[PDB]
Amino acid sequence: STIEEQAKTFLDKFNHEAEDLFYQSSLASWNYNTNITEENVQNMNNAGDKWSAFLKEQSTLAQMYPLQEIQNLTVKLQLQALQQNGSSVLSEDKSKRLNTILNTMSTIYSTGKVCNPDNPQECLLLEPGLNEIMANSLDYNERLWAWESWRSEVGKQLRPLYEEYVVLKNEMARANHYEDYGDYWRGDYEVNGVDGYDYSRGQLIEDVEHTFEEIKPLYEHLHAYVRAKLMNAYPSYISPIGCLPAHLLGDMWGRFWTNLYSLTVPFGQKPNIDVTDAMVDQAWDAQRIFKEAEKFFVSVGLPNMTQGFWENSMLTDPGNVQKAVCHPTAWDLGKGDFRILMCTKVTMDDFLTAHHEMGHIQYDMAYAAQPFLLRNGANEGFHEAVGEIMSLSAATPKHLKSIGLLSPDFQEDNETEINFLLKQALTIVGTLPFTYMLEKWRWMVFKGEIPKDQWMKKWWEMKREIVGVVEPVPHDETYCDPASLFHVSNDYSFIRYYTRTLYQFQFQEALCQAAKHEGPLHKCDISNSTEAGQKLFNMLRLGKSEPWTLALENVVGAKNMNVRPLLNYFEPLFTWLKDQNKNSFVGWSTDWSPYAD
Amino acid sequence: CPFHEVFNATTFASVYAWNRKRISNCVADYSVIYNFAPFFAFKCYGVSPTKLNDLCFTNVYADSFVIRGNEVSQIAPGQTGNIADYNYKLPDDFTGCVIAWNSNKLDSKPSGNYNYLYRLFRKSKLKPFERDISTEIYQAGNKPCNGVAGSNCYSPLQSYGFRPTYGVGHQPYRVVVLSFEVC
Ligand SMILES: *[C@@H]1O[C@H](CO)[C@@H](O[C@@H]2O[C@H](CO)[C@@H](O)[C@H](O)[C@H]2NC(C)=O)[C@H](O)[C@H]1NC(C)=O
Ligand SMILES: *[C@@H]1O[C@H](CO)[C@@H](O[C@@H]2O[C@H](CO)[C@@H](O)[C@H](O)[C@H]2NC(C)=O)[C@H](O)[C@H]1NC(C)=O
Ligand SMILES: *[C@@H]1O[C@H](CO)[C@@H](O[C@@H]2O[C@H](CO)[C@@H](O)[C@H](O)[C@H]2NC(C)=O)[C@H](O)[C@H]1NC(C)=O
Ligand SMILES: *[C@@H]1O[C@H](CO)[C@@H](O[C@@H]2O[C@H](CO)[C@@H](O)[C@H](O)[C@H]2NC(C)=O)[C@H](O)[C@H]1NC(C)=O
Ligand SMILES: *[C@@H]1O[C@H](CO)[C@@H](O[C@@H]2O[C@H](CO)[C@@H](O)[C@H](O)[C@H]2NC(C)=O)[C@H](O)[C@H]1NC(C)=O
Ligand SMILES: *[C@@H]1O[C@H](CO)[C@@H](O[C@@H]2O[C@H](CO)[C@@H](O)[C@H](O)[C@H]2NC(C)=O)[C@H](O)[C@H]1NC(C)=O
Ligand SMILES: *[C@@H]1O[C@H](CO)[C@@H](O)[C@H](O)[C@H]1NC(C)=O
Known part of the structure; x- marks a missing residue:
């Protein structure tokens, strides 16, 4: 007889009708993802569209309970996550146009071609052949030709589509009371009505700009080092007080610098640890690796596997004819069914990807008791952090000298310490300025602060101001460089890659403080310490039930993301770097340019 | 016997x-x-x-049904949930024996087995040891529904989706409860 009681009565008929209709779609998708045949494609698309139509009908039905009188918090969260109109609030023609341009953008990105100016019959796609030249070559002109032709002949096709997708998304987000699309994107970190844990969408921006200011005194030194070393592979092309040309960084855009490690290794006379011969000359099969991972996970206090995961998961690659696209994933088909998909081999990198996947699986196993709509990470960035700290801790010499792969003594020196820390920094702290800058640009575009006659100019200005790279050939307002990225064209959010990198390290410095560590942070392990597993499981089993700024307090002790753990983790490399630039010039000026002559 | x-x-x-x-x-x-x-x-x-x-009494009764996996812990004196309140409630001075075993390979077929229902909408909690076979539309709002599915008027009988590729906790378990009050 209330407008609140008819909420629980309705959520029970939806938390049982969806947990069943979702299993069909998920299983039918798995059946295609591991056995690529023709009939399986339609067998998956059928169930997929069925589940989508069911969700749409439930959404248009649940608009009868006004969110203004619901008093409980869990039912409010469920109704709010189910109520959002999302897209389709536009007219019909507008929605059709938007879908068409999104598909066109994805297709143009996937199948672009760029050839030679002296032989136009031998052009290569992006994935198998271009970012391989951009990753393995060492000649200046070849990298320059690649980086310029990938943006001159595939970028110029995305501008007259982006300049319309922007307007369409702006309208779709303003028809839901958001004031722009950037607010819709940040609407994941929103928390309202907890009295002590409030978090308005407008603050997120500020928070980012108040933590990235604490990283610069390390990124600057890393940058000066990488530059002083690059100036010995391509002499007379880099000036000692300028920026780095944006094509010598290591890949097409400069997102990760990890492909530079062969040029800028500090001590090139010590091979960092790689137990790939001890694994092979001891007859390790593709199943012993997962046994070791499960043993490590049961050491800290998390449950065993489900006994339905060993029978159905596809750990090995089916040889003769079962051609199956295997990018390592961990599935959550529901109803107590957890599976892993990865064409594993016997090397080291897969020995860590196994732990990453089992971390995802432990997370998805912990919160399987909540309702259906709340089975997800606390926000869009917790999942990968939880999955990553495990692999971060499962590659330390104290661990690999106790599992058996390494020798029992294996004398260790500070040189391999520096080596490993730098190889980590060239991927962790080398992608934060770029991510922050790209997200800032996309926000300033969607909000309307940059008129559409000033896109490329502001983009390159911000790249020179923050990241520290400069364009090698002048780019006017006909090109479109940001659209030549994968996450920008297919309409994916990007801010998460900047929050995860923070959360992750915080978790470490929390759990290592429970296991009562002694040395520096990067030599720590959470294995054989049950208190760590308990402190972590206290947060794992929450899902989206509580606001994320609470589940972050249960394990750390703060309320928001911080940046002290990252610098605490990178302190040794920092102390070494600050004593390597006595002669160089830490910093960069925004006036030099490779064409200012 | x-x-x-x-x-x-x-x-x-x-x-x-x-x-x-x-x-x-x-x-x-x-x-x-x-x-x-x-x-x-x-x-x-x-x-x-x-x-x-070594004991014996006048009459013994054998009840039998089929419930989900993680719900066997609700067939017990003084429990609460979707099973021991609307479908089968045990009194507080129970005297029988509860026994339940796995039957995954006999009652579950691929592509679903929709022949094992369980009612989850009842206006009043069940008094000890009573069954109900009603199939009337449970009306939640304030508007007569006269007996059609729709909004705030739900149908109360819903069926398990038993399948073989389930985890322990959703596979169909068979329960045979004995009550005592023959030798
Ligand atoms: C992979 O998919 C193909 C295509 O459906 C399967 O090939 C047939 O599958 C049906 C469905 O069970 C069987 O009745 C046929 O006997 C299969 N044909 C052949 C030539 O095998 C194939 O079985 C699937 N892979 C596996 C491992 O079952
Ligand atoms: C309404 O809110 C209350 C508390 O605010 C929820 O009560 C919890 O219910 C779960 C499962 O029913 C119990 O495990 C907890 O112990 C309860 N909390 C307390 C403090 O008793 C209730 O579940 C919410 N309504 C719904 C439909 O979930
Ligand atoms: C979600 O979309 C609907 C339109 O599809 C919005 O408008 C309401 O739609 C219902 C259904 O026809 C009407 O009965 C109401 O009169 C409409 N206006 C209202 C409720 O003000 C609806 O407002 C949207 N809700 C949200 C949260 O975006
Ligand atoms: C975690 O604890 C276990 C048990 O205490 C350790 O396993 C034993 O380690 C000792 C150390 O030399 C060996 O002598 C034993 O043979 C090991 N037990 C077995 C069954 O092999 C394990 O080494 C610890 N791991 C870490 C990383 O500390
Ligand atoms: C690694 O550790 C050794 C000591 O264990 C360091 O060697 C000392 O370095 C300082 C630097 O000026 C010298 O004054 C000392 O005389 C060195 N000791 C010896 C015995 O020669 C070494 O510098 C460290 N290297 C790194 C990269 O951390
Ligand atoms: C329940 O029924 C099954 C078969 O319906 C019985 O299994 C029989 O067991 C006897 C003794 O082991 C065998 O000789 C028969 O061949 C079995 N039948 C079949 C079809 O395999 C089982 O014994 C019955 N249970 C009880 C308690 O009587
Ligand atoms: C996990 O499985 C192993 C292997 O069967 C067993 O020895 C161990 O006791 C199990 N632990 C738990 C907590 O289930």
Whole structure:
């Protein structure tokens, strides 16, 4: 007889009708993802569209309970996550146009071609052949030709589509009371009505700009080092007080610098640890690796596997004819069914990807008791952090000298310490300025602060101001460089890659403080310490039930993301770097340019 | 005693209408169930599980049904949930024995098995030891529905989706509850 009681009565008929209709779609998708045949494609698309139509009908039905009188918090969260109109609030023609341009953008990105100016019959796609030249070559002109032709002949096709997708998304987000699309994107970190844990969408921006200011005194030194070393592979092309040309960084855009490690290794006379011969000359099969991972996970206090995961998961690659696209994933088909998909081999990198996947699986196993709509990470960035700290801790010499792969003594020196820390920094702290800058640009575009006659100019200005790279050939307002990225064209959010990198390290410095560590942070392990597993499981089993700024307090002790753990983790490399630039010039000026002559 | 006629029927009934078989006055031999199978769950509450053969009473009843996996822990004196409140409630001075075992390979087929229902919408909590076979539209709002599905008027019978590729906790378990009050 209330407008609140008819909420629980309705959520029970939806938390049982969806947990069943979702299993069909998920299983039918798995059946295609591991056995690529023709009939399986339609067998998956059928169930997929069925589940989508069911969700749409439930959404248009649940608009009868006004969110203004619901008093409980869990039912409010469920109704709010189910109520959002999302897209389709536009007219019909507008929605059709938007879908068409999104598909066109994805297709143009996937199948672009760029050839030679002296032989136009031998052009290569992006994935198998271009970012391989951009990753393995060492000649200046070849990298320059690649980086310029990938943006001159595939970028110029995305501008007259982006300049319309922007307007369409702006309208779709303003028809839901958001004031722009950037607010819709940040609407994941929103928390309202907890009295002590409030978090308005407008603050997120500020928070980012108040933590990235604490990283610069390390990124600057890393940058000066990488530059002083690059100036010995391509002499007379880099000036000692300028920026780095944006094509010598290591890949097409400069997102990760990890492909530079062969040029800028500090001590090139010590091979960092790689137990790939001890694994092979001891007859390790593709199943012993997962046994070791499960043993490590049961050491800290998390449950065993489900006994339905060993029978159905596809750990090995089916040889003769079962051609199956295997990018390592961990599935959550529901109803107590957890599976892993990865064409594993016997090397080291897969020995860590196994732990990453089992971390995802432990997370998805912990919160399987909540309702259906709340089975997800606390926000869009917790999942990968939880999955990553495990692999971060499962590659330390104290661990690999106790599992058996390494020798029992294996004398260790500070040189391999520096080596490993730098190889980590060239991927962790080398992608934060770029991510922050790209997200800032996309926000300033969607909000309307940059008129559409000033896109490329502001983009390159911000790249020179923050990241520290400069364009090698002048780019006017006909090109479109940001659209030549994968996450920008297919309409994916990007801010998460900047929050995860923070959360992750915080978790470490929390759990290592429970296991009562002694040395520096990067030599720590959470294995054989049950208190760590308990402190972590206290947060794992929450899902989206509580606001994320609470589940972050249960394990750390703060309320928001911080940046002290990252610098605490990178302190040794920092102390070494600050004593390597006595002669160089830490910093960069925004006036030099490779064409200012 | 005719126990093998209730532990072995080709199919049990669903929970919302369980099957009650009353035992007459004859000789009872429990030595066959005690050494029958793994018996995932077997808890006696009044009678001596190690001395069962030494007592006897007037009448014994055998109820039988099929419930989900993680819900066996609700067939017990004084529990609460979607099963022990709307479908099958045990009193507070229970005296029988609860036994339940796995039947994953007999009641579950691929592509779903929609023949094991369970009612989850009832206006009033069930009094001890009562069954209901009603199939009237449970009306939640304030508007007469006159008997059609729609908004705030839901149909109360919903079926399990039993399938073989489930985790322990959703595979169909078979339950045979004994009550005592023959020798
Ligand atoms: C992978 O998919 C193909 C295509 O469906 C399967 O090939 C047939 O599958 C049906 C469905 O069970 C069988 O009745 C046929 O006998 C299969 N044909 C052949 C030539 O095998 C194939 O079985 C699937 N892979 C596996 C491992 O089952
Ligand atoms: C309404 O809110 C209350 C508390 O605010 C929820 O009560 C919890 O319910 C779960 C499962 O029913 C119990 O495990 C907890 O112990 C309860 N909390 C307390 C403090 O008693 C209730 O579940 C919410 N309504 C719904 C439909 O979930
Ligand atoms: C979600 O979309 C609907 C339109 O599809 C919005 O408008 C309401 O739609 C219902 C259904 O026809 C009408 O009965 C109401 O009169 C409409 N206006 C209202 C409720 O003000 C609806 O407002 C949207 N809700 C949200 C949260 O975006
Ligand atoms: C975690 O604890 C276990 C048990 O305490 C350790 O396993 C034993 O380690 C000792 C150390 O030399 C060996 O002598 C034993 O043979 C090991 N047990 C078995 C069954 O092999 C394990 O080494 C610890 N791991 C870490 C990383 O500390
Ligand atoms: C690694 O550790 C050794 C000591 O264990 C360091 O060697 C000392 O370095 C300082 C630097 O000026 C010298 O003054 C000392 O005389 C060195 N000791 C010896 C015995 O020669 C070494 O510098 C460290 N290297 C790194 C990269 O951390
Ligand atoms: C329940 O029924 C099954 C078969 O419906 C019985 O299994 C029989 O067991 C006897 C003794 O082991 C065998 O000789 C038969 O061949 C089995 N039948 C089949 C079809 O395999 C089982 O014994 C019955 N349970 C009880 C308690 O009587
Ligand atoms: C996990 O499985 C192993 C292997 O069967 C067993 O020895 C161990 O006791 C199990 N632990 C738990 C907590 O289930």
